[PDB]
Design an enzyme around this catalytic site. Structure first.
Site, short mmCIF file in Angstrom:
data_model
loop_
_atom_site.label_atom_id
_atom_site.label_comp_id
_atom_site.label_asym_id
_atom_site.label_seq_id
_atom_site.Cartn_x
_atom_site.Cartn_y
_atom_site.Cartn_z
NE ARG A 25 -4.06 -2.37 1.59
CZ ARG A 25 -5.04 -2.83 2.36
NH1 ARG A 25 -5.21 -2.34 3.58
NH2 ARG A 25 -5.84 -3.79 1.92
CG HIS A 71 2.40 -10.19 -9.55
ND1 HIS A 71 3.04 -11.40 -9.51
CD2 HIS A 71 3.37 -9.25 -9.62
CE1 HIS A 71 4.34 -11.21 -9.53
NE2 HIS A 71 4.57 -9.91 -9.59
CE1 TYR A 115 -23.03 2.07 -19.42
CE2 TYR A 115 -23.62 3.62 -17.69
CZ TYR A 115 -23.99 2.70 -18.64
OH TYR A 115 -25.32 2.40 -18.81
#
Lengths: 481, 476
Positions: A25, A71, A115
């Site tokens: 992260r 990955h 979309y």
């Protein structure tokens, strides 16, 4: 269940666990501050060549393409960051040019995956161009074959000025944003003046900026956080009292500080009505907001509306206690930086960038120089070499005689041997000589740039000014004491 | 809190390691490759039919499981087509796959493949309830966590792991040598490591090298740790003008010719022996012709030792030799691979025997009902004429004789073609045949050595079908 007895492999897997959750992260990186997934997005968009020059494209297909080139990681944070770098209002600067359904700023994250049609912005052309540029190591994935770059090099501390979101992993940190123009100013002042002080660049640097446009009061937290990056500061909304044709007063806000909903605060206003802890308030209205944001509270007479504004910025969430935490990471290990040291690491990164780019161009010119050396040496003693090829037999005999007569290498000798009649006009012979000396001049120029380091600084300042010309950055917030 | 963070650390580390690190001892087959072979068996289309050119197979694979890339699944396909790297054989294919050259076959679905010959008998007995199953995350189809085996591919194909805690080298071996090792451990639970030296003279390669050491091999098969020599083949022949010509065919493993040759060019061109401008390294589509010619006034063997110092014609190839079983890693030796494969095949054979007893005794119960029906018929007919309902007929049959509900309804499943006497004798004959086979299976279940004899049977099946010699010529 577990039944794992070896504590050593538990500790090793636990260290890999901790560091991998770190790496995964968002992190305060050296060169982009980004998530690695951001780097994945950018490198995939670049090496597919999907320009904003060309028209729009369905982007979930591109998402699956990058996911399959990389990955088998989960779709969630992928599509999240896809939206986030397309959100114009949240990040201060433009990266992804979407086309669909998002929700403006009021708690409705529209996630129309069907979309998902988009392009990018024109700032990646300033961000990275490492096609030929020997810059960054690569890691290999599908049975360890295909490249993935380690970092995102640039010529630009733009992502310093963007802002970061890396909190819940271990300890918390972020990057609050500025704007760019006075950033360019203070950076160039450090460039030409390596021994400046902090507060004299605080004379160059205004407060930390916000895209909505925030009222800033106080500078002691500015003094603390430009140094040590810790502390909360106070922020207020542009809020005015306006008189009607009747003499009634109106609280009119324009915007809010960072991470504020219209609607949750509006519900909190309706609470404050039914909580019966604030008086005077009559109308809680909001219309025409798409030509420009207009939320109006309207209050009866005999109510002391400015005291009510004081009660707003005491108790309501309109007041913002915005805190900073910039706890850096430089090559894996966690650190913490001043505003100088960020730009210092930026400087030495640009040093290595331009040096390695110059060395790649150097080897280009040296290889083509050996080519044209072989061409001109072939032009020297032409008819002797005609007798050589009329005499000899093999590759070995030809290379032996050419090395004995002209002291050249094997590839040079064969590139001599690959000369046809249609490159034997004296026109093209002297064009070879001309472009040869042109490349000699370029080699000498790059050696002169190798002689002195400050040409790098000058060219960087030049193209900073080019970017500031194409990307004029007016202010939107407001600082007071 | 922090204990729950440790639980997440432990469980997620187990997830990553069991995902993409070393596979089970029980198969030696990584779950990506396991699901490749399981879905290709469940393609059903035989290798006799011409092998297909499609990504539809891999699309069903990615429908079975979502990775962090199906390009990695195609990498798994291609790396199991690398005969020059992973030995014989897992891909019946046609398309571009290259060699140990630096080859990039971007044509993904354009290659052809299907089931392979070893896979056919390698993964039978799915229809015999041998292996357990788990449901996918998609809650629609199942998958097995392990496989049935007809050899320890652990030894047949090695391991090249990654360092999640540490990587693992496991060398390949020979087919019939492994068969002889199985026979040896079967016949004797008291074997030694010299016995292993006999039935395994040494680990081999699909390419070939030289392994000069002995005690490194000894510590490899005992401790599980040690490094060996991988050496290129060297042939010193005579040039007609007097040059000690060097011919090279074998190489150390995972060593491309290209960058090695480039560094040889560099080492020549850094103020060293420069008169060796003789590198005839081509025509390698018949074999390997890696030929140089040493210059005059220079011996070949000094340049040979210098290129051995370059660590590309002679290389210290280490071995970590780790494994995964029961959720734990393990440092390896033999009688572990061996006994594990033995007891796994014991499980497979005995559970197959139990399932065959299930089918056989069910059909025996059927033919019990058949013969008891064919004893006396017309009285049953006339009492059926005294009825009007199949429930009434079932109650009548329960009054008549001892049957099952299935038996009663199967006797109701009799047209007039069933009313002969020759087919009575035929059902009685197959009934006694089935009773004899049931008693045979029961006596086999009361026989430990018979299981080993069945293992010998399948070994002799695959031995008559296939064998392989030591292509890797090893001098010690």
């Amino acid at each position: 269940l577990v039944n794992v007895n070896l504590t050593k492999e538990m500790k090793a897997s636990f260290i890999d666990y901790a560091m991998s959750v770190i790496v995964a992260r968002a992190l305060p990186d050296v060169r982009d501050g980004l998530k690695p997934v951001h780097r994945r997005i950018l490198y995939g968009m670049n090496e597919l060549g999907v320009t904003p020059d060309k028209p729009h494209k369905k982007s979930a297909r591109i998402t699956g393409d990058v996911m399959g080139k990389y990955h088998p990681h989960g779709d969630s944070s992928i599509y999240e960051a896809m939206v986030r770098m397309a959100q114009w209002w949240s990040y201060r600067y433009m990266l992804v040019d979407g086309h669909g359904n998002f929700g403006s700023m009021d708690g409705d994250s529209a996630a129309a995956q069907r979309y998902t049609e988009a392009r990018m912005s024109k700032i990646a052309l300033e961000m990275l161009r490492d096609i030929n540029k020997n810059t960054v190591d690569f890691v290999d994935n599908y049975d360890a074959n295909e490249r993935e770059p380690l970092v995102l090099p640039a010529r630009f501390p733009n992502l310093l000025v963007n802002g970061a979101t890396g909190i819940a992993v271990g300890m918390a940190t972020n990057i609050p944003p500025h704007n760019l123009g006075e950033t360019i100013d203070a950076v160039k002042l450090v460039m030409d003046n390596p021994e400046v002080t902090t507060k004299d660049l605080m004379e160059v640097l205004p407060g930390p900026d916000f895209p909505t446009g925030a009222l800033v009061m106080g500078k002691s937290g500015i003094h603390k956080a430009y140094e040590t990056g810790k502390g909360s500061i106070v922020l207020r909304s542009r809020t005015e009292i306006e008189t009607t044709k009747t003499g009634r007063e109106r609280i009119v806000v324009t915007e809010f500080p960072y991470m504020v909903n219209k609607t949750k605060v509006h519900e909190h206003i309706v609470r404050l009505v039914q909580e019966k802890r604030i008086e005077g308030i009559t109308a809680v209205r909001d219309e025409s907001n798409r030509e420009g944001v207009r939320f109006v509270i309207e209050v009866k007479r005999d109510a002391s509306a400015n005291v009510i504004l004081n009660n707003l910025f005491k108790m309501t969430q309109m007041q913002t206690n915005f805190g900073f935490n910039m706890l850096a990471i430089q090559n894996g290990i966690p650190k913490i930086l001043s505003l100088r040291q960020i730009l210092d690491a930026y400087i030495e990164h640009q040093k290595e960038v331009v040096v390695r780019r110059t060395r790649f161009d150097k080897e280009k010119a040296e290889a083509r120089a050996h080519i044209l050396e072989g061409l001109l040496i072939a032009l020297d003693h032409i008819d002797e070499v005609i007798r050589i090829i009329r005499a000899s037999e093999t590759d070995a005999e030809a290379q032996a005689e050419l090395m004995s007569k002209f002291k050249l290498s094997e590839r040079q000798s064969q590139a001599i041997l690959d000369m046809r009649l249609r490159r034997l006009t004296g026109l093209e012979r002297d064009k070879i000589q001309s472009e040869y000396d042109d490349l000699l001049a370029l080699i000498a120029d790059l050696a002169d740039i190798l002689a002195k380091p400050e040409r790098v600084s000058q060219i960087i300042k030049d193209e900073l000014d080019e970017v500031k010309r194409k990307f004029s950055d007016k202010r939107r917030t407001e600082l007071m004491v």
